[PDB]
Design a binder for this molecule. Sequence first.
Ligand SMILES: CC(=O)[C@H]1CC[C@H]2[C@@H]3CCC4=CC(=O)CC[C@]4(C)[C@H]3CC[C@]12C
Lengths: 34, 339
Amino acid sequence: RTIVRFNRPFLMIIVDHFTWSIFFMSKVTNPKQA
Amino acid sequence: VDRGLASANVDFAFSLYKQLVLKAPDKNVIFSPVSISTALAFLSLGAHNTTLTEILKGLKFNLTETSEAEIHQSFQHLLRTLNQSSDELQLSMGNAMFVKEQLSLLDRFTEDAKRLYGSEAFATDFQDSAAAKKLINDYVKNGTRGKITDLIKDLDSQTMMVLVNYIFFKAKWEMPFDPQDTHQSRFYLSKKKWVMVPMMSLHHLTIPYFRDEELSCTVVQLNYTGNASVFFILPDQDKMEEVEAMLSRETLARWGDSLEFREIGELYLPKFSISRDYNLNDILLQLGIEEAFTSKADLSGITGARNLAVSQVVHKAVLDVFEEGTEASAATAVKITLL
Ligand SMILES: CC(=O)[C@H]1CC[C@H]2[C@@H]3CCC4=CC(=O)CC[C@]4(C)[C@H]3CC[C@]12C
């Protein structure tokens, strides 16, 4: 069984399939960062 | 919808990302590429000569294969498309200009601003900086449904014009997380240090998946209800910088084309809210946008004279990820003074 665990820094790219726009781009290095 | 617009805007997104990380390598990143692209396209409407070309090339347009008029019409079509009514997902993008009433504007500029970018011109008394700041911030707060409240922190009393773009996004997961499955768990800042976060989970899920062995990362796509989705890229421990260096339109196209459906036993994703505020001045300089900030600025498309210059470009963005879906908003402001 495959497990995918986002328990370390990761990237998010929120995309629109209609326009191919990148709405938002993110790196989460620390979800509780100051 | 435009293929050439998508290509330039994605090149810009990744070029911007890389500069942000170079500037602050230890920080979270969150920004809206399309908000910044649209704000600077709006600015280029009033730009001429080197000021103009620098902006358009900085936005990653190939000016040997496109023209300023094509670019503006492409952004007009994008705004129209993005702001269509929808019963599934909430998405809106707006532009505005806040202008000193005494400043003489070309009729051609204000007409084009409204026609191409959907922007009204709001008479603003910048000499009452506190009230002018409140007005712009209220416009952004209204547009972002309260998500972004303090885009403008300081406003020079001699400001002549502020161009503003906002984007508002609210979406439900196609496959939402059950909050009963959210548990405090470790989020490893490094191999040796972690923080405790609420870790959401989904079980027995079939989603697009790609293990990129060469780049030491895993890519998955989670869908929102509607025409939007999110690419999650999970680098192996301590490989984030290797992955960041490979970020490009080509890599993203590769990833998109390599995804295959896979049954995931368990997927764990933190519930989190992050925000970042940016002074983009050095960033845009690194991407080649220089003259607009200088005494050689050519914004004569706004007024008919070379009497305006950019002082500061700012951006603020917020990303909220939780069991039901995602809320994210951003706004970009271009402050302009006399020259
Ligand atoms: C198939 C898919 O998920 C779509 C959603 C977003 C789309 C990408 C959006 C950005 C983009 C712009 C381009 O001009 C090259 C293709 C790409 C890289 C698109 C490839 C196909 C993608 C990845």
